[PDB]
Write an enzyme that holds these catalytic residues in place. Structure first.
Site, PDB file in Angstrom:
ATOM      1  N   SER A  15       0.864  -1.201  -0.138  1.00  0.00           N
ATOM      2  CA  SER A  15       0.039  -0.058   0.133  1.00  0.00           C
ATOM      3  C   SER A  15       0.891   1.128   0.193  1.00  0.00           C
ATOM      4  O   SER A  15       1.912   1.242   0.828  1.00  0.00           O
ATOM      5  CB  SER A  15      -1.021  -0.041   1.270  1.00  0.00           C
ATOM      6  OG  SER A  15      -2.170   0.577   0.729  1.00  0.00           O
ATOM      7  N   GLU A  17       1.867   5.229  -2.554  1.00  0.00           N
ATOM      8  CA  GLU A  17       1.836   6.304  -3.540  1.00  0.00           C
ATOM      9  C   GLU A  17       1.526   5.368  -4.686  1.00  0.00           C
ATOM     10  O   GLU A  17       0.554   5.715  -5.272  1.00  0.00           O
ATOM     11  CB  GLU A  17       3.194   6.999  -3.410  1.00  0.00           C
ATOM     12  CG  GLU A  17       3.254   8.373  -4.472  1.00  0.00           C
ATOM     13  CD  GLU A  17       1.951   9.455  -4.098  1.00  0.00           C
ATOM     14  OE1 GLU A  17       1.976  10.298  -4.864  1.00  0.00           O
ATOM     15  OE2 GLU A  17       1.754   9.509  -2.890  1.00  0.00           O
ATOM     16  N   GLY A  19       0.376   3.075  -5.116  1.00  0.00           N
ATOM     17  CA  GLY A  19      -0.991   2.467  -5.280  1.00  0.00           C
ATOM     18  C   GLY A  19      -0.839   1.202  -4.375  1.00  0.00           C
ATOM     19  O   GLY A  19      -0.584   1.241  -3.114  1.00  0.00           O
ATOM     20  N   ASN A  50      10.485   5.889 -14.584  1.00  0.00           N
ATOM     21  CA  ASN A  50      10.540   4.836 -14.051  1.00  0.00           C
ATOM     22  C   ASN A  50       9.615   3.611 -14.476  1.00  0.00           C
ATOM     23  O   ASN A  50      10.039   2.686 -15.051  1.00  0.00           O
ATOM     24  CB  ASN A  50       9.754   4.918 -12.641  1.00  0.00           C
ATOM     25  CG  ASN A  50      10.724   5.588 -11.636  1.00  0.00           C
ATOM     26  OD1 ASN A  50      10.407   5.977 -10.591  1.00  0.00           O
ATOM     27  ND2 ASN A  50      12.196   5.563 -11.823  1.00  0.00           N
ATOM     28  N   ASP A 134      18.852   0.588  -8.170  1.00  0.00           N
ATOM     29  CA  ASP A 134      18.206   0.888  -6.996  1.00  0.00           C
ATOM     30  C   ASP A 134      18.085  -0.615  -6.256  1.00  0.00           C
ATOM     31  O   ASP A 134      17.134  -1.198  -5.951  1.00  0.00           O
ATOM     32  CB  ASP A 134      16.759   1.486  -6.997  1.00  0.00           C
ATOM     33  CG  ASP A 134      16.194   1.799  -5.870  1.00  0.00           C
ATOM     34  OD1 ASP A 134      17.154   2.232  -5.295  1.00  0.00           O
ATOM     35  OD2 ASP A 134      15.060   1.834  -5.918  1.00  0.00           O
ATOM     36  N   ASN A 139      13.615  -3.809  -2.396  1.00  0.00           N
ATOM     37  CA  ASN A 139      13.365  -4.599  -3.847  1.00  0.00           C
ATOM     38  C   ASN A 139      14.061  -6.043  -4.246  1.00  0.00           C
ATOM     39  O   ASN A 139      14.293  -6.364  -5.275  1.00  0.00           O
ATOM     40  CB  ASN A 139      14.121  -3.604  -4.913  1.00  0.00           C
ATOM     41  CG  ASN A 139      13.375  -2.250  -4.909  1.00  0.00           C
ATOM     42  OD1 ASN A 139      12.043  -2.566  -4.681  1.00  0.00           O
ATOM     43  ND2 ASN A 139      14.140  -0.964  -5.190  1.00  0.00           N
ATOM     44  N   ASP A 154      11.846  -4.826  -8.969  1.00  0.00           N
ATOM     45  CA  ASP A 154      11.581  -2.966  -9.139  1.00  0.00           C
ATOM     46  C   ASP A 154      12.448  -2.560 -10.095  1.00  0.00           C
ATOM     47  O   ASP A 154      13.742  -2.228  -9.555  1.00  0.00           O
ATOM     48  CB  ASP A 154      11.572  -2.439  -7.795  1.00  0.00           C
ATOM     49  CG  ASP A 154      10.990  -0.948  -8.223  1.00  0.00           C
ATOM     50  OD1 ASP A 154      10.926  -0.536  -9.374  1.00  0.00           O
ATOM     51  OD2 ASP A 154      10.244  -0.679  -7.036  1.00  0.00           O
TER      52      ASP A 154
END
Ligand SMILES: C=CCn1c(=O)c2cnc(Nc3ccc(N4CCN(C)CC4)cc3)nc2n1-c1ccc2c(n1)[C@@](O)(CC)CC2
EC number: 2.7.10.2
Length: 261
Positions: A15, A17, A19, A50, A134, A139, A154
């Site tokens: 959960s 930004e 989504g 991204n 990243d 990740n 990611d």
């Protein structure tokens, strides 16, 4: 709705930004998938680039044992959806919290296991003239049965070695020479990030984003670890965060080291 039709939600597992991410079953095949639902990002925004970098990285890489598998992505009514393999053991960031809560940690054997596996992932990606940019517990994903498979996820920040379009990764894991905008050894920035990732797994205190303790690390000082680790191993982590990136081992190099099984 293709989503509401092809798949059925079992569990919310993320959960924010971005989504929401959901543990889902494909109605057709009865296999479990992690599907993320995001608002369409702003045109010209990093959220969009991204999104854009991930599309390309998915297109190039295809399938690898140590890379979370891409299956599909699509749109409905100003929302993005991405269907990926589901890793039942969650992110390493979760596993590390779990390890806080039971006063445990990753024993050296598992740290070595962790390092080598995420190592094979980077080898494949670097071999394909790409870099992740990243790398961090958040990740890295864990598929259990016994056996444990570590999988890099990611790819929002994946760019080419050749013409690097660099979105700055998490500052806690970022090598100094990338903050300086030197993009000539980015393969060794993934390597830098992997060391600190491993240090977090050892039960290191939350890593600095900036300030004295940050420059100290980038000077090649390994952050303090609670548990005791072998000289052989401690020195390998140390060289992986060497100030000179050429002095850090390559992925290929890293996955050919006696200290690792
Ligand atoms: C398709 C989207 C990306 N994504 C994967 O590819 C992926 C693969 N396996 C998995 N497994 C997973 C399985 C359990 C969990 N929680 C951990 C927390 N627990 C209390 C409850 C269980 C988390 C994760 N999750 C994936 N994703 C994903 C799940 C949650 C979150 C993320 N990714 C984010 O990294 C998305 C930026 C942040 C939150």
């Amino acid at each position: 709705s293709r989503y509401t039709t092809e798949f059925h939600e079992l569990e919310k597992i993320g959960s924010g930004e971005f989504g929401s991410v959901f543990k889902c079953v494909k109605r057709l095949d009865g296999c479990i998938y992690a599907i993320k639902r995001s608002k369409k990002p702003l045109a010209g925004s990093v959220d969009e680039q991204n999104a854009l970098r991930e599309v390309y990285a998915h297109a190039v890489l295809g399938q690898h044992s140590h890379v979370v598998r891409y299956f599909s992505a699509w749109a409905e009514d100003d929302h993005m959806l991405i269907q990926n393999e589901y890793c039942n053991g969650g992110s390493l960031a979760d596993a590390i919290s779990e390890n806080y809560r039971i006063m445990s940690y990753f024993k050296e054997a598992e740290l070595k296991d962790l390092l080598l596996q995420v190592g094979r992932g980077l080898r494949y990606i670097h071999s394909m003239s790409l870099v992740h940019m990243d790398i961090k517990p958040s990740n890295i994903f864990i598929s259990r049965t016994n056996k444990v498979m570590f999988k890099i996820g990611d790819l929002g920040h994946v760019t080419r070695i050749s013409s690097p379009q660099v979105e700055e990764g998490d500052s806690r894991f970022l090598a100094n020479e990338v903050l300086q905008e030197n993009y000539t050894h980015l393969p060794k920035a993934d390597i830098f990030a992997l060391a600190l990732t491993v240090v977090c797994a050892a039960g290191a205190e939350p890593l600095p984003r900036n300030g004295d303790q940050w420059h100290e690390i980038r000077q090649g000082r390994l952050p303090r670890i609670p548990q005791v680790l072998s000289q052989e191993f401690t020195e390998l982590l140390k060289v992986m965060i060497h100030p000179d990136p050429e002095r850090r081992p390559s992925a290929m190099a890293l996955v050919k080291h006696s200290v690792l099984l």
